[PDB]
Amino acid sequence: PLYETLNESSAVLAVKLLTCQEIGDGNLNYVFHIYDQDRALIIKQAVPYPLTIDRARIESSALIRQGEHVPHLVPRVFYSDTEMAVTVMEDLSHLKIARKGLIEGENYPHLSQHIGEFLGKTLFYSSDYALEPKVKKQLVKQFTNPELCDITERLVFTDPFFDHDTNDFEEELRPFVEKLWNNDSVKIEAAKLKKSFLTSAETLIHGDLHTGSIFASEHETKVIDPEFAFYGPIGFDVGQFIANLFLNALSRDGADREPLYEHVNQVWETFEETFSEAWQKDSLDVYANIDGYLTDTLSHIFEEAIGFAGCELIRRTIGLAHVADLDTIVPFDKRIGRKRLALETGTAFIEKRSEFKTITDVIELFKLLVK
Amino acid sequence: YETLNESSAVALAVKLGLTLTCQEIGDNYVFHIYDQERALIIKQAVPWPLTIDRARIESSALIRQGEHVPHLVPRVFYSDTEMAVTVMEDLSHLKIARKGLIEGENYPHLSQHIGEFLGKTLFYSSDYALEPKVKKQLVKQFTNPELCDITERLVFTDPFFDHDTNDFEEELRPFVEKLWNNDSVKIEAAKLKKSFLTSAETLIHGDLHTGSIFASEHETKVIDPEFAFYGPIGFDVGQFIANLFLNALSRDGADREPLYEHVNQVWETFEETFSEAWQKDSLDVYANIDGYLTDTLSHIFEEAIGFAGCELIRRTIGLAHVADLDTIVPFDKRIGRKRLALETGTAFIEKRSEFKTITDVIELFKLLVK
Ligand SMILES: Nc1ncnc2c1ncn2[C@@H]1O[C@H](COP(=O)(O)OP(=O)(O)O)[C@@H](O)[C@H]1O
Ligand SMILES: Nc1ncnc2c1ncn2[C@@H]1O[C@H](COP(=O)(O)OP(=O)(O)O)[C@@H](O)[C@H]1O
Ligand SMILES: [Mg+2]
Ligand SMILES: [Mg+2]
Ligand SMILES: [Mg+2]
Ligand SMILES: [Mg+2]
């Protein structure tokens, strides 16, 4: 049985393929930076408590698949190994985590075009529109992600909507939280959204595409950390990303929000064009080119995306796993206020998801609720 | 793997430990074994190629079904993947329902039974009844790529275009062509196929037509779940309802009433059974929020109807026909009823989300087939 947790030294496997430091943000994952004194490398390895190290196989394979379609939008992987639960990948230390960058006031003018093309291509080319069902059904097996899905199933879709252990919210927030716990019609909709997440095996999704999962500079965008990858609903990554743009918007004031709104607008438009051009060129489906079918498919993805976004908005505000955008808002009272707005916009997104005709409708409703 | 014969079949039976005679009776080989001094079936998959792995699916699927509705599926005594054999209870004392129904048997309990079959099989293998972690494992073991590929092609694709596998009377061409030129129906057919391709909700039977049921006045056994996989809850429901309708189309006037009552009753029973199971046995913290079960039922219903429309069309002009329609006489009356199968099927797909109840479904049908 050949699994051994790495150190700085054992990490410099690198040779078997001058200085090293562990730089990991988590505690579930080690991240080793290696630099030859002018040339650098990353070695990521899954630690076990509980949560198996099989995630490393998922993450590794998923980056590889993503690389076959959008190599410019994800780090190159040089080597990986299941038993050791290691992924050896490109260093991106010359870039900034998009969430950290956004909180600091960077605007990243190309973030939405890039993320948009990422979503369109990754989401299209792993679905039944792009692949023979026989082949696609095999990939569902290899990407079955029970333990990481269970995290999302609980935290994104469940726990925040009831009085559960894992929730974490200010007492000042209680009354609004309670208003959500008492809201049957929203909960029903969230259940529907969960059930889609549980059963809708449409494409190989990234499964955790928030702003902490992106490296960015003025001119480049890299999507990292697809360890939640499995076959899920097409609109989930779309929704989760959008929600995080809005989460940042809530941490800004007045005119400074405009870039985030423009990014929400652009990521959708670009996702739609990208998905569309790929549908046109590379669908295997005899139905693909009947006028109206693509359009209805995009309506359904769009409605799901908004519902999922609602869930992320709420879930990041009062659930186990928070975002810096909200948690570092200051002073206290302003934090609570913006946190209330995340609940309220989230709630609106879930309930009104099927009424929106365009992304602009979404932006405009948000603008209105956060005055 | 060795393909069996009358003798090696007997030997297997004796070697597993269960004055013998054997005949192959398959409509896949099916070996009937009888002790003159008690009976047994041994079904084996032959290698259209098409792997023998189906026999592993079928076998495991009868076992799962047996854990919840043992009275509605044959007992399985033994099975083996490598040999692709399933050894099961003999039901020769019963009639295939489709044959029975064409002869004029009414089977008064068929819908109650199949209703409870669907309610329980379809509930107890979904995320509502099982931990997702567990459920996702079953999805792996029931992945059915080759048998799914048959259905994806024959039920949801080929009939709707001018493809190889289609098979229909020339007299029927004009109505066929009307369907092929119908963009809006085809879009709906696409959506239904996409649900069939992606919606891994439960372990479905996958081929629950009237030729996959043994029946007598008092008993009902569902056989042949070799198409089993994780798909949409409403598909078996739809496919069964459609086959009741297909029989209706082969009857005239008053004699249709039992088929309509069956459509009505199977849905009623499916609803009540699924509902009682949800009440008792859901794991879902959402399960009891008033309105959620109802909405779920509406979506199952809506899909059921869409799938049924596909089965109506597909059985009329695709590769694999049903005796109900093909044996109608005279010719001209066949064509006429075959046109109604097209037109009711088309209605079911397009109007699927408009129907308030099963009665609305029956009533629309009755209207079109006057
Ligand atoms: N390819 C890389 N290049 C440079 N730094 C990286 C790279 N991958 C991860 N890191 C650093 O290590 C941290 C952990 O990576 P991440 O994939 O977010 O781990 P986790 O899945 O544990 O959240 C990142 O936030 C980043 O700061
Ligand atoms: N358990 C059984 N008891 C009695 N006869 C059976 C049994 N299973 C199959 N048969 C006979 O053999 C035929 C083939 O059964 P079926 O499961 O439909 O095979 P296939 O999957 O090839 O269609 C049936 O129509 C039936 O007449
Ligand atoms: Mg990360
Ligand atoms: Mg991670
Ligand atoms: Mg059969
Ligand atoms: Mg069969």
Question: What is the Cα–Cα distance from B231 to A292, expressed in whole angstroms?
Answer: 25
Name the token pair of B62.
């009868």
Q: Nearest CA of chain A to the CA of B73: how many Å?
A: 27
Question: What is the Cα–Cα distance from B211 to A148, expressed in whole angstroms?
Answer: 42
Q: Give the chain A residue nearest B143 (alpha carbons).
A: A137
Question: What is the Cα–Cα distance from A275 to A299, expressed in whole angstroms?
Answer: 13
User: What residue has token string 């489906």?
Assistant: A285
Would the CB atoms of B148 and A137 count as touching at under 8 Å? yes
Would the CB atoms of B132 and A144 count as touching at under 8 Å? no
With beta carbons less than 8 A apart as the criterion, state whether A197 and A233 touch. yes
User: Which domains, ranges and CATH numbers included, belong to chain A?
Assistant: 1-94 (3.30.200.20), 95-371 (3.90.1200.10)
Nearest-Å Rg of the Cα atoms of chain B is 21
Question: What is the Cα–Cα distance from B268 to B278, expressed in whole angstroms?
Answer: 15
Question: What is the Cα–Cα distance from B103 to B251, expressed in whole angstroms?
Answer: 10
Produce one character per residue of B225-258: b if its CB has 16 or more CB atoms within 10 Å, e if not: bbbbbbbbbbbbbbbbbbbbbbbbbbbeeeebeb
SS3 content of chain A, % helix, strand, coil (to 5): 55, 10, 35
User: What residue has token string 């985030």?
Assistant: A260
CB of B170 shorter than 6 A to ligand 2: no
Resolution for this PDB entry, in angstroms: 2.6
- If one counts every other C-beta atom within 10 angstroms of the C-beta of residue A132, the result is 12
Question: Nearest CA to B72 among B122, B42, B106, B110?
Answer: B110
> For residue B216, which phi and psi values (nearest 5 degrees)?
-140, 180
Name the token pair of B224.
């042949």
What residues line ligand 1, using a CB cutoff of 6 Å? Answer: A 23-26, 28-29, 31, 42, 75, 89-93, 97, 224-225, 227
Q: Give the chain A residue nearest B287 (alpha carbons).
A: A191
Which class for B367: exposed (0-12), middle (13-18), buried (19 or more C-beta within 10 A)?
Answer: exposed
In this structure, are strands A29-35 and A214-216 parallel, antiparallel, or unpaired?
A: unpaired
CA of A92 to the centre of ligand 2 (A): 62
> End-to-end distance of chain A based on CA atoms, in angstroms?
59
> End-to-end distance of chain B based on CA atoms, in angstroms?
54
With beta carbons less than 8 A apart as the criterion, state whether A312 and A239 touch. yes
Atom of ligand 1 nearest to the CA of A75: 1
Question: Nearest CA to A235 among A366, A349, A123, A362?
Answer: A123
Q: Identify the three-state secondary structure at position A21.
A: strand
Question: Nearest CA to B231 among B329, B293, B156?
Answer: B156
Name the token pair of B230.
């994780």
User: What residue has token string 């409403």?
Assistant: B234
DSSP A69-111: T-GGGS--EEEEETTTTEEEE---TTSEEHHHHHHHT---TTH
Would the CB atoms of B189 and A287 count as touching at under 8 Å? yes
Question: What is the Cα–Cα distance from B29 to B36, expressed in whole angstroms?
Answer: 22
Q: How many C-alpha atoms does A120 have within 13 Å on its Cβ side?
A: 22
CB of B137 shorter than 6 A to ligand 2: no
Produce one character per residue of A176-195: b if its CB has 16 or more CB atoms within 10 Å, e if not: bbeebbebeebbbbbbbbbb
Q: How many C-alpha atoms does B100 have within 13 Å on its Cβ side?
A: 22
Name the residue among B127, B146, B193 with its Cβ closest to that of A198: B127
Produce one character per residue of A56-76: b if its CB has 16 or more CB atoms within 10 Å, e if not: bbbbbbbbebbeebbeebbbe
Question: What is the Cα–Cα distance from B16 to B21, expressed in whole angstroms?
Answer: 16
Q: Give the Cα-Cα-Cα angle B130, B134, B136 (nearest 5 degrees).
A: 105
Question: What is the Cα–Cα distance from A350 to A154, expressed in whole angstroms?
Answer: 17
This entry's atomic model was obtained through X-ray
Beta bridge partners of B352: none
With beta carbons less than 8 A apart as the criterion, state whether B282 and B129 touch. yes
CB of B145 shorter than 6 A to ligand 2: no
Q: How far is CA A132 from CA A230, A240, A251, A280, B203, in A?
A: 18, 28, 44, 17, 22
Question: What is the Cα–Cα distance from A349 to A363, expressed in whole angstroms?
Answer: 11
